[PDB]
Design a protein around this ligand. Structure first.
Ligand SMILES: C[C@H](C[C@@H](C[C@H](C[C@@H](C[C@@H](CCN1CCCC1=O)N1CCCC1=O)N1CCCC1=O)N1CCCC1=O)N1CCCC1=O)N1CCCC1=O
Ligand SMILES: C[C@H](C[C@@H](C[C@H](C[C@@H](C[C@@H](CCN1CCCC1=O)N1CCCC1=O)N1CCCC1=O)N1CCCC1=O)N1CCCC1=O)N1CCCC1=O
Ligand SMILES: C[C@H](C[C@@H](C[C@H](C[C@@H](C[C@@H](CCN1CCCC1=O)N1CCCC1=O)N1CCCC1=O)N1CCCC1=O)N1CCCC1=O)N1CCCC1=O
Ligand SMILES: C[C@H](C[C@@H](C[C@H](C[C@@H](C[C@@H](CCN1CCCC1=O)N1CCCC1=O)N1CCCC1=O)N1CCCC1=O)N1CCCC1=O)N1CCCC1=O
Ligand SMILES: O=C1c2c(O)c(=O)ccn2N([C@@H]2c3ccccc3SCc3c2ccc(F)c3F)[C@@H]2COCCN12
Ligand SMILES: O=C1c2c(O)c(=O)ccn2N([C@@H]2c3ccccc3SCc3c2ccc(F)c3F)[C@@H]2COCCN12
Ligand SMILES: O=C1c2c(O)c(=O)ccn2N([C@@H]2c3ccccc3SCc3c2ccc(F)c3F)[C@@H]2COCCN12
Ligand SMILES: O=C1c2c(O)c(=O)ccn2N([C@@H]2c3ccccc3SCc3c2ccc(F)c3F)[C@@H]2COCCN12
Ligand SMILES: [Mn+2]
Ligand SMILES: [Mn+2]
Ligand SMILES: [Mn+2]
Ligand SMILES: [Mn+2]
Ligand SMILES: [Mn+2]
Ligand SMILES: [Mn+2]
Ligand SMILES: [Mn+2]
Ligand SMILES: [Mn+2]
Lengths: 180, 180, 180, 180
């Protein structure tokens, strides 16, 4: 079962990010060779999260993404027990030591408005800061507080649009978009 | 056809920069072993662009130079579609997320004034910021806005003059200058 | 004599930190394969000190920890003879060129209050700044002056709690805590 | 002719710095295996210069030291022709793009006062900034302008005193000091 999307993912993303995404899907029992749109989404979300955590000042963010589930919750636990924040119901993506809150990042193929609505009504962890990015350059953040300065977010949006174009160039964009 | 200028270029410039320049000429069908003055100019322009993008704050610049033409235009496209800037008629060298504009860098063996005139009247992309450097330490930037702080530009000018001297020391300077 | 704690230490800590801790115990004649709780404490203290010295601005701290005793005292001597600070009675962990004082860092399994009391009454080098961290997220610093900004200290506390959890997960936490 | 001082130098200094010092002595025809005190002085001066240039902000300094004589003068030439500073009579150690002046660094085994006098009366390049360091923690800079912030200079003085101690520990200090 060799998908053009699998080969595309492997050439489009850093090998470390492909490895971490494969390990994520295996931690949830999914298979990157079958759920290839999901493979691509997970790689994209990972790259966005790493770029995001690179946006801050040094030591600003604790990266929860890209860890195995047990260790991700371990670090969440330590953050909660040393800071006093409430433990989220669902796994966040980052923790912000500057603003002292968890960040749940999202990347959507649709209007950021409706994806943000879904996530907010899902988690309802309140304290957890939400930050949606779209493949068209839109973003949406809790309380209109976008955490990072403009240029760091602009980089992320540029990269998302480049991924979109690469997929389109290979005719994978349609199925990806109509898979979410 | 072994030129002293080819060997000089290979010893004067970083091997990565020589490789990227060779790939640029091949993308336009030119041959570094024949167009050796052009080889040297492309290597120089590349080093200047990389030093330039190093001048900013972290994440400040998107580097368009040193990519294949298709991918360079891809990244231009993403920048335009996420920021709303007008798409330049000709390929720029960088994008500035701080000031939100494309930078077309030039390096000339003549008066910066006349090279800047040529480029401005050529592209006339208006929004695109022009920044000329010369092999004698002069520079010229759109609206007298030089983007970078003094020291970062001084480094570039020093390196340009050192290249000029190295060429002169080997007696390549005259043909280079009278080739532009 | 193969301890679960020895294997745990070797998988929990960076190999460089394990090596430096082994060399420390050998410099004092102790054996990491027997004093395994002490092995773990020394590794932890080392990681905390390195994170601490990473918190500052560049060039801010001189690291005294992780050197052999002779060289540690050599660097203390040079600091004292170039700055004019009084030579501590006991080896400190860092020197702060910004605030111009030695830092003795401590990590305790008990109330930071009582460990700080013990160290202060022990060294009584006055000028030497004390900074206690606990495995529960508490800290205590001379004159309520915590040297580093909040986020750098938060990172350290998170890591301490993660170590605590890893030990607990393996059922080593109890003996560790009841060993201090 | 195997000197304890040669072996000491090779173990005390980074291998890159030993290599650059050997190349310096060869550029002036001297031999590190005979002029071993001079070998040590050149290595020390090199380490001080590199620490110095590390003190600044990024791009602040152009390093003239550690180049072959021809290329050192080449870079001096480029600095002079792009900035307009007067060309020093003797080779400086650094150039400061922030303050726009050449720095001649000195390291002395005697009172900084008398070494500074000697150098100032020697070069008399006026514009060239002088900065003396001593093996006892004293420094002396033109116009009481010490260029770098306190901590960066403190590091240098600490390292100088550590070198002094290492030499003393091996009984080389006396001959070194009575060689200058
Ligand atoms: C270099 C990276 C920098 C960064 C990734 C970043 C964070 C990862 C890797 C650390 N890991 C990997 C598994 C074990 C562990 O601790 N973390 C931290 C916590 C959990 C996690 O997964 N770090 C830090 C260490 C090395 C590393 O990669 N970025 C940002 C862009 C994409 C990317 O990868 N860079 C720089 C550019 C290219 C690149 O790849
Ligand atoms: C290290 C460099 C830093 C910098 C070059 C810079 C940008 C290049 C390389 C990235 N690449 C290469 C092809 C694939 C890709 O993504 N980019 C970015 C976008 C397109 C492009 O071509 N980067 C970043 C990654 C590594 C690298 O080189 N500089 C500045 C001075 C000359 C130079 O090269 N440094 C530091 C000093 C010596 C050196 O070489
Ligand atoms: C890279 C490290 C950075 C840092 C450690 C730090 C300081 C050590 C090593 C230097 N040494 C080792 C023995 C000989 C000598 O001079 N010093 C300095 C003085 C005495 C001492 O022991 N340095 C600087 C040089 C390399 C190095 O490790 N940190 C911080 C986190 C844990 C850690 O190790 N990093 C970055 C992240 C992973 C890692 O390991
Ligand atoms: C890494 C170093 C950083 C720094 C040295 C510094 C400057 C040297 C080397 C560059 N070179 C070597 C010969 C060809 C060339 O261009 N320059 C620059 C101009 C002429 C010269 O000689 N650079 C920059 C490139 C790599 C390098 O070493 N420092 C500071 C401390 C001692 C030291 O070496 N670091 C960091 C800590 C350990 C170490 O060694
Ligand atoms: O962290 C996430 C996660 C997000 O953070 C997210 O933003 C969107 C979606 N997520 N989910 C990610 C994920 C992440 C990125 C893109 C798509 C998916 S789709 C489901 C899935 C995920 C991981 C492995 C796997 F096999 C999956 F089927 C799961 C939800 O359980 C916690 C971890 N996690
Ligand atoms: O980006 C440039 C470019 C510049 O950015 C530039 O400043 C001057 C000149 N350029 N041109 C560069 C180039 C770049 C630097 C120095 C000389 C040349 S000379 C023509 C040429 C170039 C690349 C390959 C090649 F084979 C060429 F003949 C082309 C114009 O088409 C877009 C890419 N490009
Ligand atoms: O630097 C320290 C040191 C501290 O800095 C410290 O905070 C607590 C305790 N220390 N001691 C450390 C140490 C460091 C960290 C955790 C536990 C121990 S327990 C005794 C011991 C140490 C080193 C080797 C060894 F074999 C030991 F038995 C010794 C006191 O002699 C100066 C060096 N040193
Ligand atoms: O740059 C220096 C230099 C200094 O910058 C300096 O501060 C003191 C002394 N210098 N001199 C250095 C030197 C540098 C550091 C310590 C001792 C010496 S002692 C003579 C000597 C030097 C280099 C090679 C050699 F074989 C020598 F005999 C020569 C003076 O000619 C320009 C280069 N240079
Ligand atoms: Mn996640
Ligand atoms: Mn997410
Ligand atoms: Mn270009
Ligand atoms: Mn250009
Ligand atoms: Mn210690
Ligand atoms: Mn300590
Ligand atoms: Mn010199
Ligand atoms: Mn000097």
């Amino acid at each position: 079962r060799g998908s053009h999307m699998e080969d595309f993912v492997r050439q489009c993303f850093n090998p470390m990010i492909v490895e971490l995404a494969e390990k994520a899907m295996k931690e949830y029992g999914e298979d990157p060779k079958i759920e290839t749109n999901k493979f691509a989404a997970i790689c994209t979300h990972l790259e966005v999260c790493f770029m995001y955590s690179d946006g801050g000042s040094k030591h600003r963010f604790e990266i929860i993404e890209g860890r195995d589930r047990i260790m991700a919750w371990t670090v969440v636990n330590s953050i909660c027990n040393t800071t006093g924040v409430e433990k989220p119901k669902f796994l966040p993506d980052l923790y912000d030591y500057k603003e002292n809150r968890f960040i749940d990042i999202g990347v959507t193929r649709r209007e950021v408005h409706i994806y943000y609505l879904e996530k907010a009504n899902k988690i309802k962890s309140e304290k957890t800061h939400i930050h949606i990015f779209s493949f068209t350059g839109e973003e949406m953040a809790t309380k209109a507080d976008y955490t990072l300065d403009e240029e760091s977010r602009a980089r992320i949006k540029t990269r998302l649009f480049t991924i979109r174009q690469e997929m389109a160039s290979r005719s994978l964009w349609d199925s990806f978009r109509q898979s979410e």
